[PDB]
Design a protein around this nucleic acid. Structure first.
Lengths: 97, 106, 95, 82
DNA sequence: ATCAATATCCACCTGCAGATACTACCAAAAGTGTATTTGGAAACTGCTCCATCAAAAGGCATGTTCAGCTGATTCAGCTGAACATGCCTTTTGATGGAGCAGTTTCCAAATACACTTTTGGTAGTATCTGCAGGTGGATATTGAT
């Protein structure tokens, strides 16, 4: 019976995903969301495949960078766990709020 | 001889705006309705701000709009605030705002 | 003794319309003048780009309208769009 | 087994994103906060892209529509044209 | 410490997705030549306003005192990491059709252009007015007790 301690695999994953560049959200669910949001602006839309792709690339870059800021905000408060108030602070300072 | 302003029912100078679009190198051609529509948006926006700023002046028992009044008007309005989100109004100062934890007792 | 244009008299006209007994300091006017110029540049610019993107050599009230929707937030856009449409419609029937 | 589209952005997927962002430990409430943030992000961008679509009289949102929307939101993207 | 589970590193293998080389072509730049337009440097000089300075008006520097905030310590309890798999959603690929995009068309609206009127800016001289900064004097707010 073998068990890795909390944080061991988490580190192993940070290393893994910082090495690679593949998108980390499954394509289909992301596509549905995109279409759902767009439907509120105009009905019966079609999407170029590359258009969805562009949006995913941009959305994932955005969220990845937001998590870095968020992580700094957690660490500023002497924690190692990210919380919504960290995301909130990062967005307020970025001037998104 | 009726000005293009009066023709469109506007205070803002349609002639001037047509001219600035040419001199401004925005495209080869400027359509005739473009300076009309633009001058109206411009006029609408300035009515919106002078309305709100006038109120701040009154709220302050003042008769003359000063830069503080424009600031209060813009920052107190969600949309104008966002539209001028990366703009500084000289001599406007800031909104009174003190964070909770900074107040005394409990 | 070169001439320097501003939107002052127009800003003042509109000011009397909305608050007939209220004045404006010269510094506030200077800020109003800057605001008008600024928004002008931002709308013309979007219009410029939009036209280029669609291989068009002409900026029409249609380009301005999309620029307005791109530039202004929610409710200011909606109202600017009506005011601009209204002015052009009125303008078309007036010669 | 009906499910909201936003929930299609799953915990493991948000976990992966955080990981790339160098995050070691993640609060249970973060998953819902992230979805909300993604929603506002996509609304703002799609709104502008669709606006570009309508202007061109199309029923298809093009990569360029999206690339242009990203540029004006100050989130320039390279790789899809322009 | 030893020890065993399991992750990680590397050398070598290989099919194919994605890169590349090559030919014939054509519309469309990019370039060459000649006739024409003008933008802006230069040269001169009116005249705004910048650097400079002397007296007057008020904020800054400094040291002492201690209130209360920060950061260290400890601790218990809550909360998120780790875990294993068949369900079920996503991915992959095969196939009709929507609409984007290429092409020709023709006129409403664009530019150009020349006298003709209007008006927004300024500039010189005049009178007006909102409110800043001074006053005294009634109403809080704060902190010792």
């Amino acid at each position: 019976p073998h068990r890795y301690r909390p944080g061991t695999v988490a580190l192993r994953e940070i290393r893994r995903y910082q090495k690679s560049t593949e998108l980390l959200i499954r394509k289909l669910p992301f596509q549905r969301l995109v279409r759902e949001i767009a439907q509120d602006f105009k009905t019966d839309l079609r999407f170029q495949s590359s258009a969805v792709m562009a949006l995913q690339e941009a959305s994932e870059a955005y969220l990845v960078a937001l998590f870095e800021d968020t992580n700094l905000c957690a660490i500023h408060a002497k924690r190692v766990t990210i919380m919504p108030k960290d995301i909130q602070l990062a967005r307020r300072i970025r001037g998104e709020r | 001889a009726k000005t293009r302003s009066s023709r469109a029912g506007l205070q803002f100078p349609v002639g001037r705006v047509h001219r600035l679009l040419r001199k401004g190198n925005y495209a080869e051609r400027v359509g005739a309705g473009a300076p009309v529509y633009l001058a109206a948006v411009l006029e609408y926006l300035t009515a919106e701000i002078l309305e709100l700023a006038g109120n701040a002046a009154r709220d302050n028992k003042k008769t003359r709009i000063i830069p503080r009044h424009l600031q209060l008007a813009v920052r107190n309005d969600e949309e104008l605030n966002k539209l001028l989100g990366r703009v500084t109004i000289a001599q406007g100062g800031v909104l009174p705002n003190i964070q909770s934890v900074l107040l005394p007792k409990k | 003794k070169t001439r320097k244009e501003s939107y002052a008299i127009y800003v003042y006209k509109v000011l009397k319309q909305v608050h007939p007994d209220t004045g404006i300091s010269s510094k506030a006017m200077s800020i109003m003048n800057s605001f008008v110029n600024d928004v002008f540049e931002r709308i013309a610019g979007e219009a410029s780009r939009l036209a280029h993107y669609n291989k068009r050599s002409t900026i029409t009230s249609r380009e301005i309208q999309t620029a307005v929707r791109l530039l202004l937030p929610g409710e200011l856009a909606k109202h600017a769009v009506s005011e601009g449409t209204k002015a052009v419609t009125k303008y078309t029937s007036a010669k | 087994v009906l499910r909201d589209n936003i929930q299609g952005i799953t915990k493991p997927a948000i976990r992966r994103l955080a990981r790339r962002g160098g995050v070691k430990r993640i609060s249970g409430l973060i998953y819902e906060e992230t979805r909300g943030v993604l929603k506002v992000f996509l609304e703002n961008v799609i709104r502008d892209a669709v606006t570009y679509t309508e202007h061109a009289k199309r029923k298809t949102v093009t990569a360029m529509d999206v690339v242009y929307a990203l540029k004006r939101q100050g989130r320039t993207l390279y790789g899809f044209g322009g």
